[PDB]
Amino acid sequence: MVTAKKDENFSEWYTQAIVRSEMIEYYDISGCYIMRPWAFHIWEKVQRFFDDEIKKMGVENSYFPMFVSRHKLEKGFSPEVAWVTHYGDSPLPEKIAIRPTSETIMYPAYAKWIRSHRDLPLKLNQWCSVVRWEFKQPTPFLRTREFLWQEGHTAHATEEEAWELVLDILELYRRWYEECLAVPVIKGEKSEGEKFAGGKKTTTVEAFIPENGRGIQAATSHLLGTNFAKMFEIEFEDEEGHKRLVHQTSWGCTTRSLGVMIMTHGDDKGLVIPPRVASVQVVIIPILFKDENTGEILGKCRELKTMLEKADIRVRIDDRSNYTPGWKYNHWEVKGVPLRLELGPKDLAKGTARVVRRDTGEAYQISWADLAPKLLELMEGIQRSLFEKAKARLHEGIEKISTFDEVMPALNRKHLVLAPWCEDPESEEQIKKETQKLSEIGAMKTLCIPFDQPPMPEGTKCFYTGKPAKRWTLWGRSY
């Protein structure tokens, strides 16, 4: 069982939650972790959701190689690239890189495949892993040296169409977090200093971890413009006869999303899994002691399971004999199963069952006949409730502010700041450095410029420079 307290040592709580729920197993290669089935089946849920959704958009899956030649890759990230140099004892004629991202592997094929407006839009995605030798401290899910993701890369005839796809994908990531994982996120645009330097505009959805005050980028979606098209010579012929550059997008989201989910809903007893992505929504536990009606109990459990399945409820009967009922309660609780259904002799007589919801611990006596619709109601309730409590914590954790003197105090309260900003290059680095210096006695950066802009009253001044403010910008410590 989990013994560290989420509000005290957070990092130790997280480690305990993911190990004791059997999500993660540690590994001898640093920054790498084993995803056990309990975590993996959650990734399968969100994977299936996103993948179904992008299919409706006409995006197709493919698989490109995990290797890229030195000279193709080498056309700030350099330190992260893993190099293969040998096969057995033999040195490769030339060393080869493992993919940190697939632009240099995909875009030469894009140049070849695209000839005319007839070939556009080209819309591809891949589910794969990538390797980056991260310099930051690793954390399971959130920052790992090998991670699972999808990366989508599209090419369009016009900026308008590309940008519309950017925003579509972005909305899909909001749905991945908000609708599947009950994790609230803020859509936004990256500052000129945080955006992907290979693109024209980077959009993002951002989450927040109240326990350490860190913002975290939850996913990303780029309008690439034409810069990659010029570099790779991805050109097409218009409906006229002239050579046009394509307008591109790329987008990706990772198993980080699972870490965000765990941190968001988990409590002092361990995991809490939103019903929508729980592989086991309801666990049935027969209560067996001193041979009291052992046969009938097991019989009704099996009957209840089938009834519940007709409603598409995902049910496990834990009928393992080599474990106590109490052991089962702790087990499925640490694992975050939304609903436990208990059934002993007393309940068997009554035509009822005791049900405990994992999020609040509330118990219910419920008649066999009402189980299906009551459990469905409890599940939407759990799911909606997890989200709305997270949303309130997110909103309690953001402070509207007007001057730089408000910054350092709000960071100490472990909050982010929404502050009006002139959006000039040098200020962000100055702010990072200044907050860096003040902290060690660290750094604050732009998280995003939210799409949802509060009113900006005429003449309002940027919080740091004093110049005229353009827009409101969300700032904080971050992963």
Ligand X SMILES: O=C1CCCN[C@@H]1CCCn1cnc2cc(F)c(Cl)cc2c1=O
What SS3 state is found at 432? helix
CB of 60 vs Cl ion, minimal distance in Å: 12
319 near ligand ANP, rule: CB under 6 A: no
Cβ distance to its own copies smaller for residue 11 or 61: 61
If contact means CB under 5 to 8 A according to the sort of partner, which of ligand X, Cl ion, ligand ANP, none does residue 352 touch? none
Q: Which does 276 bind (CB under 5 to 8 A by kind): ligand X, ligand ANP, Cl ion, none?
A: none
85 backbone dihedrals φ, ψ, rounded to 5°: -125, -15
Contact positions toward ligand X, by CB under 6 A? 77, 80-81, 100-101, 132, 151, 196, 220, 222, 250, 252
**Nearest approach, Cβ of residue 48 and its own copies (Å):** 10
Are 169 and 163 in contact by the 8 Å Cβ rule? The answer is no
Type of residue numbered 267? D
* Residue 41 binding result from ligand ANP, ligand X, its own copies, none, given CB thresholds of 5 to 8 Å by partner type: its own copies
Q: What is the largest CA-CA distance in the chain?
A: 86
- Find out whether 407 and 435 touch, Cβ atoms under 8 Å: yes
Q: To the nearest whole angstrom, how small is the minimum distance from the Cβ of residue 152 to ligand X?
A: 8
Residue 89 Cβ, how far from ligand X at the closest point, in Å?
A: 13
Nearest to 249 by CA among 156, 315, 140: 156
Total of residues contacting its own copies (CB under 8 A): 58
Q: Is 80 helix (H, G, I), strand (E, B) or coil?
A: helix
Report the C-alpha gap between 195 and 202 in whole angstroms: 5
Alpha-carbon distance 166 to 450, whole Å?
15
User: Which residues ranging from 4 to 43 are in contact with its own copies (CB under 8 A)?
Assistant: 25, 27-29, 32-37, 40-41, 43
- Which among 180, 55, 185 is positioned nearest to 123, based on CA atoms? 55
| CB distance 207 to 215 below 8 Å | yes
Query: What is the chain's Cα-based Rg?
Result: 26
Alpha-carbon distance values, 468 to 31, 191, 432, 433, 471 (Å): 44, 17, 20, 22, 10
Distance CA 372, CA 389 (A): 26
**Partner whose binding site includes residue 254, from Cl ion, its own copies, ligand ANP, none (CB under 5 to 8 Å by kind):** ligand ANP
Among residues 7, 25, 44, 377, the one that binds Cl ion under rule CB under 5 A: 44
- Which residues have a Cβ under 8 Å from the Cβ of 404 and sit 6 or more positions away? 463, 464
Query: Minimum CB separation from ligand ANP for residue 407, in Å?
Result: 21
- 39 versus 218: smaller Cβ distance to ligand ANP: 218
* Six-digit token string for 345: 């002799």
Give, in order, the Cα–Cα distances in Å from 174 to each of 183, 204, 206, 374, 461.
9, 9, 9, 29, 31
Judged by CB under 6 A, which stretch of 40-48, 213-221, 271-279, 349-357 contacts ligand ANP?
Answer: 213-221
48 binds, among its own copies, ligand X, Cl ion, none (CB under 5 to 8 A by kind): Cl ion
Q: Does 60 help bind Cl ion (rule: CB under 5 A)? A: no
Kindly tell me which residue out of 3, 52, 87, 310 binds its own copies, with binding defined by CB under 8 A. Answer: 87
Residue number with CB closer to ligand X (132 or 357): 132
Q: If residue 425 lies in a helix (H) or strand (E), which one and from where to where?
A: helix 425-439
Q: Is 203 in the site for ligand ANP (CB under 6 A)?
A: no
Residue 323 as a binder of its own copies (CB under 8 A): the answer is yes
> Is 52 one of the binding residues for its own copies (CB under 8 A)?
no
Contact between 250 and ligand ANP (CB under 6 A)?
no
Structure tokens at 477: 């410590």
Q: Which does 151 bind (CB under 5 to 8 A by kind): ligand X, ligand ANP, its own copies, none?
A: ligand X
Tokens of 255: 């198993």
Instruction: Fill in the amino acid letter for 244.
Output: R
Q: Residues interacting with its own copies, by CB under 8 A?
A: 25, 27-29, 32-37, 40-41, 43-44, 60-69, 72, 78-90, 95-96, 98, 109, 112-113, 116-118, 124, 128-129, 131, 133, 146, 148, 320-323
Q: Residues interacting with Cl ion, by CB under 5 A?
A: 44, 48
